[PDB]
A paper describes a structure:
Members of the rodent protoparvovirus I species, including LuIII, H-1 parvovirus (H-1PV), and minute virus of mice (MVM), are utilized as replication-competent vectors to target cancer. The T = 1 icosahedral parvovirus capsids consist of 60 VPs, with the protoparvoviruses assembled from VP1 and VP2 in a 1:10 ratio. VP2 forms virus-like-particles (VLPs) for members of the protoparvoviruses that are otherwise antigenically and structurally equivalent to VP1/2/3 genome packaging capsids. LuIII kills transformed cell types that are either completely resistant, or less easily infected and lysed by H-1PV and MVM.
To enable comparative analysis for identifying the VP2 determinant of selective tumor tropism by the protoparvoviruses, the structure of LuIII VP2 VLPs was determined by cryo-electron microscopy and 3D image reconstruction (cryo-reconstruction) to 3.17 Å resolution. At this resolution, the VP2 amino acid side-chain conformations were unambiguously assigned into the cryo-reconstructed density map, from N-terminal residue 37 to the last C-terminal residue 587 (VP2 numbering). The LuIII VP2 monomer structure contains the core secondary structure elements reported for other Parvoviridae structures, with nine β-strands (βA-βI) and an α-helix (α-A). The conserved jellyroll motif contains eight antiparallel β-strands that form two β-sheets (β-BIDG and β-CHEF). The LuIII capsid is ~280 Å in diameter from 3-fold to 3-fold, similar to previous reports for H-1PV and MVM. In LuIII, this depression is 4–7 Å deeper, and 15–22 Å wider than H-1PV and MVM, respectively, resulting from multiple subtle side-chain differences within residues in VR5, VR6, and VR8. At the 3-fold axis, the single “windmill” shaped protrusion is the same height in all three viruses, but is narrower in LuIII compared to H-1PV and MVM, and has the same curvature for LuIII and H-1PV. At the 5-fold region, the depression appears wider in LuIII, due to a difference in the HI loop (VR7) residues that line the floor of the depression, and differential positioning of the apex of the DE loop (VR1) results in a 5-fold channel that is more open at the apex for LuIII.
Residue numbers in the entry:
A (entry chain H), B (entry chain Z): 37 to 587
C (entry chain Y): 540 to 587
D (entry chain Y): 295 to 343
E (entry chain Y): 393 to 490
F (entry chain W): 442 to 490
G (entry chain W): 344 to 392
H (entry chain Y): 50 to 98
Write the structure that this text describes.
């Protein structure tokens, strides 16, 4: 049944575990939120452009160019995709510690207890008071995109996904998508004589796509007694591994054989002289086998062009860089460490006066990192003790430029390269992503662990059907309408598959553990606890605590 | 089920295609709108007349006479008939390009989510604020005319049909129909001494028809939980052809045989001398066969009296002229090119300051056009090189009048005449029409491609049942009542039949294609895209891109 | 699914110099014929 | 931030210092349309001739 | 008769002159020494620039499969018998698997 | 430049290297990483699972 | 080329390919084995490997 | 001539027939030959590689 005065759904946020057999777990995560929806600020679609004359007009500022072209819509999307939505911090600890790999299974979603209210103002004498009252006949439009016709638009990009706190209400992300303006921009250094083109092109007859929610899809009209239920969507994806790899290229294979065991705990072991050592190496003209030059099964990780900007018709952009360990060289960019900026709803702390809170995610998987300053290329024919001209060192200048070194432009990717798939991030991390429709596809998307093979889960779009006053002129440029807002509950169920880790190691494994307050380490428990006034903060948890044997 | 707080319908505007077999397509077009209905400005029927003393009082202004007699009704009609309602511009492109002929099949309609609200004013001190609130007990009257008892009154005539934009709300057209006043008016030229009768007659006992919605039809009363559904109406109509004909009367049949192929690409071919040529001609006393005078199977298109005004009892009116190609003579009227005037809702642009936007539709089907200035009649017995007195040329004066020429009054229509049926127009075009009840019927209606053979689809009439105050005097001349307005959704489904075009031609066919902005051609894509502020414009698309072989 | 009209391959009148001028797909007086590359993939697509 | 007033006017965005997003650049607090993280590289530079 | 086929798929193109590499640690408004610009000389050679020898292909790279050409285009091709095979042949849209 | 230059791309095809009768390795185990090399260098055969 | 992760500097592998008439072994990644009498060598050889 | 057929929703079977008259000449040599082209003129001068 249903109707006004009868609630159409229930609130379940709790997470469940079930053991299907040996090592297997079915993780069923419920999540529910109250969502606050405002009447759209314009009833009609708009094609708008941002263009920076101030930033890009001055020389050398290219990196900050924001210029693009977008289609603004009245619709808003409820985006359930982040890790921080589905799990509470302890459930993330329990999973990160105990399980080798995890995989997505199904997703369900529902909307219920729709409530639309209207606002009037009185009496305007002294100070106005705003009176709130229901419209029982009003409705809310709801459209799900099953076929992914519309441009796929993850909200986590801007951190607009549903809030991470069950008890706080949350808001939708207004739906919008790109349009093709064909920007032109020119390259300069800090102080340079000349001009900068900095122009944007006219609309393209070939490339112009304009989509409309109403034309594209079926819209459900939900009044207070109505409820909407998405069917069960089943993921097809590859599981991801929850245990990090420590094992470098130089740790692969059989170690050399030591001559004899050391006498005392301080003493170092010794090896057969490199001249007489037996092994396999690709160096020519020298009779040696040494731990550095011996042949390894594959390359682990690879050098990458870093802080390079490639420019197609759209404009300059930094190409992605696969997340890899930061070596002791501390250099973040060459290894592609992610850096998030996020608000109080998703993170930060309610005590913080700053507008946003920022965190750099330094990758685990210590095997694939690259120290940039210590990488070097050596001349052929090979020689021990190269003179300066026989070795390519990072300290030298490239093209006569001081701060540009070969490791900037150098690219090692090849058939022999192996790297681990990067890791999920509990708050602020993206759970899944849609695969690009191109024929030749990337081996991984950079931000998202899971990539739906065929068809991604559909986007869920909502808006308030307009409430019109007595006077409505369809030809009028301006539209007067009744101030209106609404609220509704969103409930969803995400099922997962995971497998317990075996532990064969003698020694204790590393684990995620809370720590007493008063010591400054990252895990101090005060940060997961409320304050006196209720200010709460939610910070990224390390993932993949447990080591793994690569080879 | 149903009730307050439970929505009675769904919103589907999308268009579907299905392939029934070889070449056949079933096009199912859904369309949906939000409709804004105001309480009628008078509760009772009225018989009113407009009579121009100012326009027609002065001499020679006859063409602008507006005088008529009409029955004004409180009811309003929801009129779904235009092409611009059902299809989006791309769906019109896809159909116009790929299909030879299309035909109507069925029509469905529904009304749901009725919402009635009332308006009060307070406190009138400082500035008044208008408070809006529901009447859950109020109802809306809905009457469909299945039997076409009432005068058939297409709203597109005045461009009052439902708006062409799915996301913008739209308004009904107030229902009204003609009544017979028997006007009298006299003919004068620009400055002339005399008087003009310019009178209108008394009501006629023979000809007076006064219809009332309540007496005529069954009315459904719809409250907020109620919904109304029209049955399925099935068209009986003849399909229309979507491919234009280029083939003139002089392109019919077998060409003459050339003597020999030309030597070079510049050289013209030569034909057997006209004295010796073999053929068939109706000219007498001359031994010739020439491409102009040879006999053709039929006349393609025909000369027409153009800008003639015939006057029955009602008054002077211009008789219609079948749409035909405009020849290189550019003359629009002789070939009957349609000219539309329409508003922002149906067209125009929201940026335009003008009240209306006007477009002249120049007919495709290049075969049937008539250059007026170059048509001529020649004396009998026929002669080559006629002296001035043997030929009737358009340049000569008729009846001693300078600008009146024989091509004005000349009428070629005969048994041998063949012409193509004119073409649909995506915005502003009328889909169907009802056939006149006269015994001897026209071969085509001029504006509408489809004409329902027996019984046209019914007219859908709606009004708000009156809300009365506490004081109601049935004998009072004036009626006070509660200010009331309402909104509801209209949804309809139009199924079509169409057939894919075969292409036997070597060369590429002409097609409707978008074009880059910045060039001024009619198809520049900017015109189908929103502006920054949301201003959108919708302009007529060419139809029948593909050529066809007449004979 | 797009509102606006899609781009299409279309012949064009002779006398304008654009690549699609129809004269190029038609024979000459002496029969000389020319066949030139046609654009492919006229219709835009949504990558992501 | 808001819809533009007239068809000529350009829209404006949240200041790059305060913008929320994801980028791989280090040591700078910004999010700008050029440096933000994208799912994959589309096309690639190539040794040519 | 000669014709240059300019690829459609406007997404994957590269303007060469405007591609640049920037030094680490990153900085806004790089001075000349912090940025690698196409205009500079490589190995002291005038017309040789880094974009000539630079190769971006990596795991993150996605590109569309090129397009057929109505006259003069090759319909199919045979796949090389090598063990490790190219992801696409350049001229031919279709490549027979076996 | 041939020292640091890397031509590997989508168009690249190469034969799988060859076994060596004495001193050659018959098989090898595949690394447990998610994204795996197309071949191990020394060993002709690589056990899938 | 020698790339260095946390473990230390190491030469990255190079797929075996033909040595061209340029005789250059390293660029084409030609394998070089060192082995003892048990697996090879000769029992007459005085050398260790 | 070329034919089209619609197998269902959205699917088309395109069947293209083509036919030609072919003109074959007696081969200019009855036996196999192993021939080489070598440019002394083009490649002899510098830079023409």
């Amino acid at each position: 049944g249903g109707g006004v005065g009868v609630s159409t759904g229930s609130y379940d946020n709790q997470t469940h575990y079930k053991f299907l057999g040996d090592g297997w777990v079915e993780i069923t995560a419920y999540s529910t939120r109250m969502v606050h929806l405002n009447m759209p600020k314009s009833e009609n679609y708009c094609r708008v452009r941002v263009h920076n004359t101030n930033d890009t007009g001055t020389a050398s500022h290219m990196a900050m160019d924001d210029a693009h072209e977008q289609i603004w819509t009245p619709w808003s999307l409820v985006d359930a995709n982040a890790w921080g939505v589905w799990f509470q911090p302890s459930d993330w600890q329990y999973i990160s510690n105990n399980m080798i790999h995890i995989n997505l299974h199904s997703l369900d979603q529902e909307l219920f207890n729709v409530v639309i209210k209207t606002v009037t103002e009185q009496n305007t004498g002294a100070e106005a008071i705003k009176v709130y009252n229901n419209d029982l006949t009003a409705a809310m439009m709801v459209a799900l995109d099953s076929n992914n016709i519309l441009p796929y638009t993850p909200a986590i990009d801007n951190q607009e996904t549903l809030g991470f706190y069950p008890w706080k209400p949350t808001i939708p992300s207004p739906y919008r998508y790109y349009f093709s303006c064909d920007r032109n921009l020119s390259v300069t250094y800090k102080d340079e004589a000349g001009t900068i083109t900095d122009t944007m092109g006219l609309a393209s007859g070939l490339n112009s796509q304009f989509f409309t929610i109403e034309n594209t899809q079926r819209i459900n009209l939900l009044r207070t007694g109505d409820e909407y239920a998405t069917g069960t969507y089943y993921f097809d994806t590859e599981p991801i591994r929850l245990t990090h790899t420590w094992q470098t290229n130089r740790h692969l294979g059989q170690p050399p054989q030591i001559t004899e065991l050391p006498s005392s705990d301080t003493a170092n072991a010794t090896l057969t002289a490199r001249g007489y050592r037996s092994g396999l190496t690709q160096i020519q003209g020298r009779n040696d086998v040494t731990e550095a030059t011996r042949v390894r099964p594959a390359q682990v990780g690879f050098c990458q062009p870093h802080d390079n900007f490639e420019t197609s018709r759209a404009g300059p952009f930094k190409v992605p860089v696969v997340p890899a360990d930061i070596t002791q060289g501390l250099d973040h960019d060459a290894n592609g460490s992610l850096r998030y900026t996020y608000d109080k709803q998703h993170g930060q702390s309610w005590a913080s006066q700053n507008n946003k809170d920022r965190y750099t995610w330094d990758a685990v998987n210590y095997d694939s990192g690259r120290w940039t300053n210590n990488c070097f290329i050596q001349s052929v024919p090979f020689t021990s003790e190269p003179n300066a001209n026989q070795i390519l060192t990072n300290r030298d200048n490239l093209a006569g430029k001081t701060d540009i070194h070969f490791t900037n432009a150098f690219n090692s990717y090849g058939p022999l390269t192996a790297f681990p798939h990067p890791a999920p991030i509990y708050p602020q991390g993206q759970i899944w992503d849609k695969e690009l429709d191109l024929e030749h596809k990337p081996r991984l998307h950079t931000q998202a662990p899971f990539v739906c093979k065929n068809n991604a889960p559909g986007q869920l779009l909502v808006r308030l059907a307009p409430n019109l006053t007595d006077q409505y002129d369809p030809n009028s440029s301006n539209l007067s309408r009744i101030v209106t807002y609404g609220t509704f509950f969103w409930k969803g169920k995400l099922t997962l598959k995971a497998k317990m880790r075996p532990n064969a190691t003698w020694n204790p494994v590393f684990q995620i553990s809370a720590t007493n307050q008063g010591t400054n380490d990252y895990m101090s428990i005060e940060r997961w606890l409320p304050t006196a006034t209720g200010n709460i903060t939610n910070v990224p948890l390390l993932s993949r605590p447990v080591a793994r044997n690569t080879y």
